[PDB]
Design a binder for these strands. Structure first.
Ligand SMILES: Cc1cn([C@H]2C[C@H](O)[C@@H](COP(=O)(O)O)O2)c(=O)[nH]c1=O
Ligand SMILES: [Mg+2]
Ligand SMILES: [Mg+2]
Length: 683
DNA sequence: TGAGGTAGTAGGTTGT
DNA sequence: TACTACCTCG
DNA sequence: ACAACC
């Protein structure tokens, strides 16, 4: 490292727990009927809530900061239709030691419920769970935006309250769908009932009368809702054709008077105005302090003391094209890290002629600097020819074309997806560049160029340094359906001079089956074997999010058997809180060790962006020092080739894995058979 | 579809 | 998880 | 149901 510094977390030390709070009441829970296996925990949480006071689940029972006599000790629960009778039996009170982890966990849950409960009786603040919104940040015709904070409250091992505070905004609609449309506002993309929290997707807006509309049951829309007594205080307006978010293939009648639009930033782009909800970190730190003080004051918890942590500045990563670069885009001028002779094709959908002179010039320039030969083909064919177009594609692929650039006006989602999938089935990855295009838009088309090159299989940049792991692979799950795709991507070589993806697998949920984890890993090992002519001495395993229990067990045992060292790191995009400099400036490359095997990592930060959200990492397995892992992950973040001016927050293999399973989730996996693993089709 | 993150808005999974 | 808006271009 | 993540 090149310097240890000091930072604030967005945490605050408050008053010590009083001697009553350290000795909570213990209660035994008795349910009739006794719940089933899968009901016990939700029922325990529910009874902890029905009890009242400040009580939480403790093991099979309850812990409370309220004595039992001021609790609702007897009552009834409803759960999925079934009714349960409950009674709570006082079992004395037992001291909890903050020095001990589990007991501290109980004290912390109690603290959280404390925060919730005291927030509940504030006036007149908009409270939503653990969020509190005081000020009004912005208003408008039928809409307003509130400003406040998301909060949390737990217990330190020294026995004091720790308050986490992070400024937050909240968008609220005040008028119904009918009233909303009565202001010249366009149709919102989403909407919810007024009687419950269920939401819909708003499509058309029919003109059929609600008192003469055949509802799948006999009665009409209008008196169907009137029977439920929904439009008594309300008033049904027009007919709105909504659709289920999980079943959009079945339009449904509804009443504009019984709907309330759910407002997003693209429902307020009309007003434009300003609505910048990102905060400069100085302002966010200020708001954090102010809010922390307010909360500590109104809740009788004392004056906040901003907590401090020792941070370490990490070595600057050394990015390489043919020469050293500061950004991946500079490889276009200097040359790529590695380049074979390549053949790119051009597909024009704007009816215009061949290659734009400046794109051609830039490509020739970059390949000249790389000392590699270039072939610019032009696709003289159009998708509206039908299968003949596919024939054209096949001929292009046979002549050595590796990827094609598609110049087109903005395409609709479906047409974009369909075109890319089609090109994929003929083994051709595609880069789209939108066709109102001027040479002055160099960021857009240099990035398009970079993506194009990554898709042809080139490595535009690489890292220079000594790293513990010679192979780094990321795992993620993606897809917007009942099922998901679990996928892996990798950087092979200490330099990261080879980026590969592997064929994903369909899976029920977020957890990736052990066999699948291993198989993807074996594919990446095989990539390494094929490039280096040996097995890697050490691999860095990067999981997006939490690592489900034993998910990597089989793969880790397999690695052990082959004599390959490993590190498993959980990389969490949220839950890391915030970090602020005690000193002057806030820079990235920041490494903040907290617990053992778990640390924070500020990978990316631009001042014109808001406040950075540091990654939270847990070293789940392996014996590599935290500092080395942080070092390599931080540098790997700089290895991504398809973003020429801004580095991703995630290490390249995870970013890649993510875009891979996202794209497979969109297009489907059926198109990927003839696409080379070296070609990053999904960037 | 230019890319990135920070913001927001919906939704989900894992697991006690 | 995945969407859009904002702003700018290590 | 809630948790700490996606
Ligand atoms: C009763 C009924 C309602 N609906 C639609 C119209 C209602 O506005 C919408 C919402 O009803 P709900 O929220 O009470 O479940 O369901 C049908 O499509 N068919 C039916 O048979
Ligand atoms: Mg994920
Ligand atoms: Mg792309």
């Amino acid at each position: 490292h090149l310097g240890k510094t000091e930072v604030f977390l967005n945490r605050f030390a408050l008053r010590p727990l009083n001697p009553e709070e350290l000795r909570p009441w213990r209660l035994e829970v008795v349910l009739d009927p006794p719940p089933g296996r899968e009901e016990v925990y939700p029922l325990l949480a529910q009874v902890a809530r029905r009890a009242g006071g400040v009580t939480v689940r403790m093991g099979d029972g309850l812990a409370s900061w309220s004595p039992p006599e001021v609790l609702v000790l007897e009552g009834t629960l409803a759960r999925m239709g079934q009714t349960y009778a409950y009674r709570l039996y006082p079992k004395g009170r037992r001291p909890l030691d903050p020095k001990d982890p589990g007991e501290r966990s109980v004290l912390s849950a109690l603290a959280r419920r404390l925060l919730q409960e005291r927030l509940r009786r504030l006036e007149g603040v908009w409270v939503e769970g653990l969020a509190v919104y005081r000020r009004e940040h912005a208003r408008g015709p039928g809409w307003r935006v509130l400003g406040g904070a998301v909060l949390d409250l737990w217990v330190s091992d020294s026995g004091a309250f720790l308050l986490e505070v992070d400024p937050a905004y909240r968008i609220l609609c005040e008028m119904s769908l009918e009233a909303w449309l009565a202001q010249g506002h366009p149709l919102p993309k989403r909407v919810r009932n007024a009687y419950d929290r269920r939401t819909w997707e708003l499509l058309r807006l029919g003109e059929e009368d609600p008192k003469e509309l055949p509802l799948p049951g006999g009665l009409s829309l209008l008196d169907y809702h009137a029977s439920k007594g929904r439009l008594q205080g309300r008033e049904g307006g027009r007919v709105a054709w909504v659709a289920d978010p999980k079943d959009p293939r079945k339009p449904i009648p509804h009443l504009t008077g019984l709907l309330v639009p759910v407002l997003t930033l693209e429902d307020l782009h009309e007003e434009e105005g300003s609505l910048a909800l990102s905060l400069p970190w100085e302002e966010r730190r200020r708001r954090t302090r102010e809010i922390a003080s307010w909360i500590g004051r109104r809740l009788g918890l004392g004056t906040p003391e901003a907590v401090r942590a020792q941070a370490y500045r990490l070595s600057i990563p050394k990015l390489m094209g043919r020469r050293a670069v500061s950004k991946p885009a500079d490889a276009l001028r200097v040359g790529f890290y590695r380049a074979q002779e390549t053949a790119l094709a051009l597909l024009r959908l704007d009816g215009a002629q061949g290659w734009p002179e400046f794109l051609r010039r830039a490509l020739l320039r970059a390949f000249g600097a790389s000392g590699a030969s270039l072939r610019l083909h032009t696709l003289h064919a159009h998708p509206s020819q039908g299968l003949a177009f596919r024939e054209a594609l096949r001929k292009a692929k046979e002549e050595g074309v590796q990827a094609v650039l598609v110049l087109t006006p903005p395409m609709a989602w479906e047409d974009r997806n369909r075109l890319k999938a089609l090109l994929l089935r003929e083994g051709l990855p595609s880069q789209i560049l939108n066709v109102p295009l001027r040479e002055e838009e160099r960021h857009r088309w240099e990035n398009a160029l970079l993506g194009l090159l990554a898709k042809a299989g080139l490595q535009v940049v690489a890292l220079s340094g000594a790293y513990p792991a010679e192979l780094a692979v990321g795992f993620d799950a993606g897809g917007r359906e009942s099922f998901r795709f679990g996928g892996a991507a990798c950087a092979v070589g200490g330099d990261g001079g080879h980026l590969l993806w592997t064929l994903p697998e369909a899976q029920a949920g977020e957890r990736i089956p052990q066999e699948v984890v291993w198989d993807l890993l074996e594919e990446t090992l095989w990539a390494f074997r094929r490039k280096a002519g040996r097995l890697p001495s050490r691999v860095l395993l990067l999981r997006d999010g939490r690592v489900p229990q034993d998910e990597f067990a089989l793969a880790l045992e397999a690695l052990a058997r082959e004599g390959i060292a490993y590190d498993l790191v959980s990389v969490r995009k949220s839950g890391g809180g915030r970090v602020y400099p005690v000193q002057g400036r806030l820079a990235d490359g920041l490494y903040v060790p907290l617990e053992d095997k778990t640390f924070l990592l500020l990978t990316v930060h631009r001042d014109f962006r808001g406040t950075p959200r540091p990654l939270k990492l847990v070293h789940e397995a392996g014996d590599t020092p935290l500092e080395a892992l942080a070092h390599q992950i931080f540098h790997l973040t700089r290895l991504y080739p398809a973003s020429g001016f801004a580095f991703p927050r995630l290490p390249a293999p995870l970013h890649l894995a993510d875009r891979l399973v996202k794209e497979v989730g969109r297009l489907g996996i059926r198109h990927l058979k003839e696409v080379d693993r070296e070609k990053l089709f999904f960037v």
